[PDB]
Design a protein around this ligand. Structure first.
Ligand SMILES: [Mg+2]
Ligand SMILES: [Mg+2]
Ligand SMILES: [Zn+2]
Lengths: 60, 127, 24, 112, 206, 98
RNA sequence: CAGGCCUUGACAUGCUAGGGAACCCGGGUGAAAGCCUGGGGUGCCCCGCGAGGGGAGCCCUAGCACAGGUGCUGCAUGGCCGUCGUCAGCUCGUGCCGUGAGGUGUUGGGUUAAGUCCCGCAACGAGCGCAACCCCCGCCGUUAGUUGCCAGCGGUUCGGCCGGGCACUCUAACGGGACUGCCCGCGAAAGCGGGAGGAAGGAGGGGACGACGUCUGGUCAGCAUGGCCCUUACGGCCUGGGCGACACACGUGCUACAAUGCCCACUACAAAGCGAUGCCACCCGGCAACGGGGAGCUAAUCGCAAAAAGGUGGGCCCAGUUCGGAUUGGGGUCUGCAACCCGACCCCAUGAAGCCGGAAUCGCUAGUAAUCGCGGAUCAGCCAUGCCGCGGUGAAUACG
């Protein structure tokens, strides 16, 4: 019961209350970042790759 | 005319000045003994000025900005010591012998993840 | 203490304002 | 260049390299034979040579077992006396098949 | 298993971002969902040439879409017809003016995401994994390299017992930053499950 | 008179291309208050390394937005041709106000 | 989970067929979903005065191949993480001893945070680890100045506000610094102890980095994926319920049982981030939540903003209390179609247990522990006392 939902989330024909987020690459609704449009997993994944502009490993 | 010292310590920054004269001391446009009123630590800052003997020879004007009401006092004690080492080369025998010269690297460390407060780890169950 | 809503600290810790901690 | 680290290092490295290989350069080929003082001392060596069929000459005494030496020099192996007397006239008979007959070699400097 | 991504770890030094532009908060998620969806079809219809990088640079409505390939004789086509329909497929979804440069490969044996795919394939073809690894390493070194390390996951020969094949030579300092160690990961979709291939081509020190 | 912002990410490129517009603006007339560095805007987000359930030893990265301002003092018709056409930002941004 | 519905299916693509085809606005019934039903009429490719007719996209109906599954197996797997463990370790090459498993190196002496290094030695090298390269605070400098300052003469409506200025401060880019190179003491060396100089020595203090491997560890529920299992349903829509149920028990945490204190008025000092139907200055309405207007910000230039503890003097006087805020009644406000389940905030009144905690047990060696306040992310709102960051005050002790 994941496929129908990934599209049901884009679809905003119903109240803006129910209009939550959803990771772009994978159908992950949790730990979604408004900025990247990914979840915690993918974020870390792309950042390790470099496909994340100016997104670098922290070292302070 | 003016005698300047570079005060700084633990995210605090004091700009100290010294015009020969009375003995009064100012900090951020308010009397020294009035800004630091209730801190029994305050009068400790002017401690290098009591090992040099020249407190009433220098009207101190300081503008410290940042840190804490006490962290500022620590920075001030560097710029009260660093300011009278500049205009006096023989006054090096109180900034080294009576250690008055170091920014005190004693800074707050980073809080590590899985360490409530950088080192204080959480509660241990085992059970 | 910091739990009694009706106080200056009970209003602070709970990050809200009221009769007992108005905006200046 | 090279930080003061690699200078102390690479130096030392050449130092010891040298320390042990001052004379083990020369020929980059398996010695046609080997001459040795106390064969029971550097028998390890003698073994190597022996396992390679490399002919072996050496100056052994009673401390040393004859059998396993191809060419045998029976005599003192400690007092610097006999050592020079057999090293000398051996390295002397060496060059006397190349030309250049000389006087004896440096030996006395504190020789007793 | 542990060991942080050698790519994400060098990112600071050595490896320059494989997508180097900017975007204020307002719009970044979209240039992100773009760059991403783009690599989605450039890695499909172009893998036959076998691409080992897709750099993408920007400024204001133009795109780099630079594709590095070891075999650009399928990227350009038969005179200029192929890439003609690839600047078409690009701007087809992207409402911008998408260019498209192309670099070659000064050694497909010295590119990791290349050797990682080079092995990935041999596995779906039922090759001796041991030999397919000891090989894809002995290929990188005979071809101008200081270090090579090739790692296969589980199910070698399809065995119900998932193993872990390990092959290296020379030096591969993964704890170093001056490592310039190329790396890339290819799969393999055999009938007996999934496989994995890690490629560790240590290049130049300093 | 004219203000020009330089936003972006990389401080090596955002630095070279903000020093170029410093020698080619003095050569085009009015003086130009050199490359000034204003505070860098960080954006650190923390993500749990484990894909599953491993609340501890996680991993977080940053996003360093390096600002850099440069001001030209007098609005020639000279500089207006050097700058309006010498647009060479590789992964950089530039605003212009007055 | 109960109930009410839909099957070329909520999403992919391919093929066949008269009709209509791009799209917009409705109506009836209903909890919604769904089912049924009433209305304008189309730029296209083109023989054509035109009617009209072929027709490519898309769309609608039928049918077909198939979609879909958070259904099972993490001992069938990928990927990725936890872990012993920042542990000093783990191996290969050739030679060498051994019938062989396998030794040797990597043992031995000394040293170190360490297979750190030196000296030894049938071994000599090398790899993965260690260290080093990378980032932060440090001490200082060059470049650059709209943050900053009677720092200097200056005018100043008496606020860096105006002129005016890069010295400060800072901001941020790049360099210098520390290396057992100087003196003493031990030794063959590695090296240690002691001292001067220095902002800083013997890795300077914190990060990022975690070896062959181990736990048939964890995850098919993020995803990927082998096989199995389901298909008018183990798929799919929706209304409501549920994950918040409660006689209990454990874990992690918050606030405390008080005078080193609680309460009120008034007065000071941080750092890091964050903000367009977003952070709200200043006003007025309200005890207040909040609400009517409304300046400013693309944000070192305005806003969140008040930092709190602390400083000043004032009331409680040891009292289940002005200690302690659960519980419950009544009245409200904001987001939202919707606060009964089951939201947080606000006001009045309820003012429960607890007067320091059995046995057991947890954390930390210095800006640490304790203690106080702030941001961020997620997010309409929020049951955040959580988590990741930040700083103000600042110890106790280490014989062994
Ligand atoms: Mg070593
Ligand atoms: Mg410790
Ligand atoms: Zn994802």
């Amino acid at each position: 019961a994941r496929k129908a939902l990934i599209e049901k989330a884009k679809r905003t024909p119903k109240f803006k209350v129910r209009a939550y987020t959803r990771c772009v690459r994978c159908g992950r609704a949790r730990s979604v970042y408004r900025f990247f449009g990914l979840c915690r997993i993918c974020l870390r994944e792309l950042a390790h790759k470099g496909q994340l502009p100016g997104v670098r490993k922290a070292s302070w | 005319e003016q005698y300047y010292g570079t005060g700084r310590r633990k995210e605090a920054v004091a700009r100290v000045f010294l015009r020969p004269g009375n003995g009064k001391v100012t900090v951020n446009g308010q009397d020294f003994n009035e800004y630091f009123q209730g801190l029994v630590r305050a009068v400790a800052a002017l401690e290098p000025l009591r090992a040099v003997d020249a407190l009433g020879r220098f009207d101190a004007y300081i503008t410290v900005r940042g840190g804490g009401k006490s962290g500022q006092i620590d920075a001030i004690k560097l710029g009260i010591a660093r300011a009278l080492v500049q205009y006096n080369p023989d006054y090096r025998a109180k900034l080294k012998p009576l250690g008055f010269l170091t920014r005190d690297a004693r800074v707050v460390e980073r809080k590590k993840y899985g360490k409530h407060k950088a080192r204080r780890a959480p509660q241990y169950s085992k059970r | 203490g910091k739990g009694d809503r009706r106080t200056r600290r009970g209003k602070i810790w709970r990050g809200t304002y009221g009769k007992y901690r108005p905006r200046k | 260049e090279r930080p003061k680290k690699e200078q102390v290092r690479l130096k030392h490295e050449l130092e010891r390299l040298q320390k042990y290989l001052s004379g083990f350069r020369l020929l980059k080929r398996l010695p046609d034979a080997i001459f040795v003082v106390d064969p029971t001392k550097e028998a390890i060596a003698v073994r190597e040579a022996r396992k390679l069929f490399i002919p072996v000459i050496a100056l052994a005494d009673t401390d040393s077992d004859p059998d396993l030496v191809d060419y045998i020099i029976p005599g003192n192996d400690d007092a610097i006396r006999s050592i020079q007397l057999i090293l000398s006239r051996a390295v002397d008979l060496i060059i006397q098949a190349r030309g250049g007959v000389v006087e004896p070699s440096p030996s006395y400097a504190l020789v007793q | 298993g542990n060991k942080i991504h050698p790519i994400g770890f060098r990112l600071g030094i050595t490896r320059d971002w494989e997508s180097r532009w900017y975007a204020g908060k307002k719009q970044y998620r979209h240039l992100l969902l773009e760059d991403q969806r783009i690599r989605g079809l450039l890695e499909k219809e172009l893998y036959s040439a076998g691409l080992a990088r897709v750099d993408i640079e920007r400024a204001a409505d133009n795109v780099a879409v630079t594709v590095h390939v070891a075999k650009p004789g399928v990227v350009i086509g038969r005179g200029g017809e192929r890439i003609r329909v690839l600047r078409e497929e690009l701007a087809k979804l992207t409402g911008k003016n998408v260019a498209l440069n192309v670099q070659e490969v000064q050694n497909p044996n010295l590119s990791a995401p290349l050797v990682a795919q080079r092995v990935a394939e041999q596995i779906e073809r039922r090759f001796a994994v041991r030999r397919a690894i000891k090989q894809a390493v002995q290929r990188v070194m005979e071809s101008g390299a200081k270090g090579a390390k090739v790692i296969v996951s589980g199910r070698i020969g399809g065995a119900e017992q998932a193993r872990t094949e390990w092959a290296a030579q020379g030096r591969v300092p993964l704890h170093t930053l001056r490592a310039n160690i190329d790396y890339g990961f290819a799969l393999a979709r055999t009938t007996y499950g999934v496989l994995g291939v890690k490629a560790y081509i240590f290049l130049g020190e300093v | 008179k004219i203000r020009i912002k330089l936003r972006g990410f990389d401080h090596k490129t955002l630095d070279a291309s903000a020093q170029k517009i410093v020698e080619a603006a003095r050569r085009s007339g009015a003086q130009v208050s050199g490359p000034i560095p204003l505070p860098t805007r960080v954006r650190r987000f923390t993500v749990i390394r484990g894909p599953f359930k491993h609340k501890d030893s996680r991993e977080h990265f940053e996003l360093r937005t390096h600002n850099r301002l440069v001001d030209i003092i007098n609005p020639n018709r000279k500089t207006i041709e050097q700058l309006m056409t010498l647009d060479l930002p590789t992964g950089v941004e530039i605003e212009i106000k007055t």
